[PDB]
């Protein structure tokens, strides 16, 4: 109805949300090996999967980082309470993730390697 946004604007909005979420995670989990983000959004609650090489890092001590990131994305995008979760998964074959290798090369060059 009137409250609902049109499908044309709607599907553009979801692409905007994914692009904005990817950029935020790219800047934050860069040194942690962030590979990509998968968003399985459902009408009831959405869910966000973070693809990173070093999962025990994206999840801090007792999962403080993930709880923070879950709260941080909750406030920015106005998600309703308890309707969004963040999962962290290890990406298989990290040598075939161009993002992971490019981030690894960035870290090596910043270290001082030739």
């Amino acid at each position: 109805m009137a409250v609902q946004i049109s499908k044309k604007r709607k599907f553009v909005a979801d692409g905007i949300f994914k692009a904005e979420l990817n950029e935020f995670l790219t800047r934050e989990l860069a040194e942690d090996g962030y590979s990509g983000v998968e968003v399985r959004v459902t009408p009831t609650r959405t869910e966000i999967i973070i693809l990173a090489t070093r999962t025990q890092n994206v999840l801090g001590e007792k999962g403080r980082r993930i709880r923070e990131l879950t709260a941080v994305v909750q406030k920015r995008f106005g998600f309703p309470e308890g309707s969004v979760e963040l999962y962290a998964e290890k990406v298989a074959t990290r040598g075939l993730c161009a993002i992971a290798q490019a981030e690894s090369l960035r870290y090596k060059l910043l270290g001082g390697l030739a």
Partner: protein, 55 residues
Amino acid sequence: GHQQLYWSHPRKFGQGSRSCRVCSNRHGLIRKYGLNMCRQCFRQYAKDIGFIKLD
């Protein structure tokens, strides 16, 4: 200045009202489909949004 002229100028419309949602720029904006994004920024995030290139 004092609370009655710092932002006093009306900005309900025009280029000043609208800025890129990514880089806060006011030039070459794309307000179609509710993007509100920069001409250059859209080319950067076109793949992530879903705008692929067919022809």
